[PDB]
Amino acid sequence: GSSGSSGSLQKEISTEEQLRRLQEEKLCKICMDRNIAIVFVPCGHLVTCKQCAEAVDKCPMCYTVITFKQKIFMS
Ligand SMILES: [Zn+2]
Ligand SMILES: [Zn+2]
């Protein structure tokens, strides 16, 4: 003889997964390791992070020479 039957209908996502969805959608796209905190000039494309942005001499998407490393403050 035993008892105990419970079951509530609910569900939610934690910051871990959630963020992993957006955080991994805006951040760098080349290495996808760090967060995008730099743009390109003239074409402003923050599709790269401090590392990449610097590594790539010219926009890896617009092949437009980067003669300026502007830093944004999205956060
Ligand atoms: Zn990167
Ligand atoms: Zn560009």
From Swiss-Prot:
Region (Required for ubiquitination and subsequent degradation of BCL2 during apoptosis): 28-75
Zn finger limits (RING-type): 28-63
Summary of the tissues where the protein is detected: Expressed in colonic crypts (at protein level). Ubiquitous, except peripheral blood leukocytes.
Record note on modification: S-Nitrosylation down-regulates its E3 ubiquitin-protein ligase activity.
Subcellular location: Cytoplasm; Nucleus
Entry-annotated residues carrying S-nitrosocysteine: 28
Pathological condition linked to this protein in its record: Lymphoproliferative syndrome, X-linked, 2: A rare immunodeficiency characterized by extreme susceptibility to infection with Epstein-Barr virus (EBV). Symptoms include severe or fatal mononucleosis, acquired hypogammaglobulinemia, pancytopenia and malignant lymphoma.
This protein's domain notes: The first BIR domain is involved in interaction with TAB1/MAP3K7IP1 and is important for dimerization. The second BIR domain is sufficient to inhibit CASP3 and CASP7, while the third BIR is involved in CASP9 inhibition. The interactions with DIABLO/SMAC and HTRA2/PRSS25 are mediated by the second and third BIR domains.
Function according to Swiss-Prot or TrEMBL: Multi-functional protein which regulates not only caspases and apoptosis, but also modulates inflammatory signaling and immunity, copper homeostasis, mitogenic kinase signaling, cell proliferation, as well as cell invasion and metastasis. Acts as a direct caspase inhibitor. Directly bind to the active site pocket of CASP3 and CASP7 and obstructs substrate entry. Inactivates CASP9 by keeping it in a monomeric, inactive state.
Similarity annotation: Belongs to the IAP family.
Assembly notes: Monomer, and homodimer. Part of a complex composed of SEPTIN4 isoform ARTS, XIAP and BCL2, within the complex interacts with SEPTIN4 isoform ARTS and BCL2, SEPTIN4 isoform ARTS acts as a scaffold protein and stabilizes the complex. Interacts (via BIR3 domain) with DIABLO/SMAC; the interaction inhibits apoptotic suppressor activity. Interacts with HTRA2/PRSS25; the interaction inhibits apoptotic suppressor activity. Interacts with TAB1/MAP3K7IP1 and AIFM1. Interaction with DIABLO/SMAC hinders binding of TAB1/MAP3K7IP1 and AIFM1. Interacts with TCF25 and COMMD1.
Name of the protein in its database record: E3 ubiquitin-protein ligase XIAP
Shown residues in whole-protein numbering: 430 to 497 of 497
